[PDB]
Amino acid sequence: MLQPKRTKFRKMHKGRNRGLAQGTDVSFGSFGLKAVGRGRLTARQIEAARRAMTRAVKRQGKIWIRVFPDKPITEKPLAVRMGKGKGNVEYWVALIQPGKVLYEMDGVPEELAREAFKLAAAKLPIKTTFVTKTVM
Amino acid sequence: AKTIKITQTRSAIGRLPKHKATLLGLGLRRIGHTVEREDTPAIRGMINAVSFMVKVEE
Amino acid sequence: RNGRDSEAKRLGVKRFGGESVLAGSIIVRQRGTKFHAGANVGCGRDHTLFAKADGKVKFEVKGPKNRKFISIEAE
């Protein structure tokens, strides 16, 4: 997992998830995995795919994880009554909006890069899509 | 300041007091009301807000 | 395990810009000093900018640092 070092707070609001994404463009790499859907990517999910992605390309190329969870969402201990303050932080989720590019890759030929992301897609909950960079 | 007829089509029950008072400002009372007024942005502005439930007859 | 609060102290603008006030009429009730006193406007110990003369209100932004000022024109 990827935990943000030294946060200002501990626990916050759950907020709302709506709106499109910022990183529509593809930089730092050649190809990427843009997110079509709108969901919640937990830390263990993001960790799972990235490990499994470099497994496919076999150490050649570099990865750009253009996101970070940094939003602590709690859980109450089971069988407890609804009340008595907020429970403890359990994991880290990042809100992914439609159009957010998750992982990047360069220095690797298209086809092998194609299957790596395709095998990285099955670890994710939300519906994604493949995307190619473009000059301007 | 041209003479213009205003028709009330729908009923105002599930509306806001802002929209309900607009009907009171135009004299529209019951369903099937035809009252003759004049034109100016002050009057037409009232029709501009609730044009969904009122029908205009210039 | 903290659950404490404070009953709000009613801040803000009680008499907005464009209305004729009386002498001693509180214009803006501010905790800080965002607004600074202009012509015929006094500053209290709680920096509550109130009126001195009688007339209408003008929210004129003046000063090199562009702080917001309020004055009163005799109206």
Binding site: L20, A21, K34, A35, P98, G99, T134, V135, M136 | - | -
Partner: protein, 94 residues
């Protein structure tokens, strides 16, 4: 070198913009210098494949609106977030 036919718009806002985006068309804007920014509407389908050619972003076009041909250059593009499709292209009148 791009036969991009276009028509001058008459409705330029939010509501009318998408009604033609549903009819396979997207708006553009030709601006440059002292002239007035001409509201341009063009067919979406065509340019969807025209930007596949890399030299499209660095060369002059042969865009014609009402007979007369204007020479312009591609400035920038605002594409759709997740759906790989065009929305609005900024044209610098060259």
């Amino acid at each position: 070198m791009f036969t991009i036919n276009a028509e001058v718009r008459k409705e330029q806002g939010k509501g009318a913009s998408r009604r033609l985006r549903a009819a396979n068309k997207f708006p553009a804007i030709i601006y440059g210098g002292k002239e007035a920014p001409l509201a341009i509407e063009l067919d979406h389908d065509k340019v969807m494949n025209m930007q596949a050619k890399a030299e499209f972003y660095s060369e002059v076009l042969t865009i014609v609106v009402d007979g007369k041909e204007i020479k312009v250059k591609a400035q920038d593009v605002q594409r759709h977030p997740y759906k790989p499709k065009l929305q609005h292209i900024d044209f610098v009148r060259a």
